[PDB]
Amino acid sequence: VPRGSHMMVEAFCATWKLTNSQNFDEYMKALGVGFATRQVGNVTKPTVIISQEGDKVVIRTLSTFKNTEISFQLGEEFDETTADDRNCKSVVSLDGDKLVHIQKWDGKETNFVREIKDGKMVMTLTFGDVVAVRHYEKA
C-alpha cells in the first residue's frame, strides 16, 4: 500500500535457485500434501523467477515437476491454484522488507515469508506449528 513498496519488491527481483531446504517434508505432511507429491517435492530443486511487470508482481516457478505462475498486486486478493493442487484465495503484501504470501482454503491458512539475508532469498513456510525454511541463491 505505502510508497517505497515497489522499490522493496525490486530487491527480490532475480532468478533464484534452491540451495537448501530444512523441514520441508514435515511441512508438506502437515499441509496435507499427498504421498506422491511429497516424494517428488522432497527431491526437486525449483528455480523461482520474481519480476515486476507494470504494477503487477510475478512469481514464476520452474521445476522438473510442476511449473507455476502467479501475478498479483500487493495487498489485492487473487485466486491461486498451487503446485500441490489446492485452490486458494491468496494475498501477497510487504511487511517492511519482507514479502508475505498468505493462502486460505478449506478453513485453513498457510503463509510464506520471503526475505533477503546474506544476499540469499530465505523463505519461511508455516502451517500451524510446523515450519520449513528454504534458501535460494541468485543465478
Q: Which residues bind ligand PLM (CB under 6 A)?
A: 18, 28, 33, 37, 41, 44, 46, 48, 61, 63, 65-66, 82-84, 134
For the purposes of burial, counting CB atoms within 10 Å of the CB of 36, is it exposed (0-12), middle (13-18) or buried (19 or more)?
exposed
Minimal CB distance residue for ligand PLM: 41
Nearer to ligand PLM, 7 or 113 (CB): 113
Mark the binding-site residues for a fatty acid, compressed into ranges.
134-136
Nearer to ligand PLM, 18 or 91 (CB): 18
Closest CB 124 distance from ligand PLM, rounded Å? 11
Nearer to ligand PLM, 2 or 64 (CB): 64
Closest CB 73 distance from ligand PLM, rounded Å? 20
The contacts of residue 130 (CB under 8 Å, 6+ apart) are: 23, 26, 27, 29, 30, 31
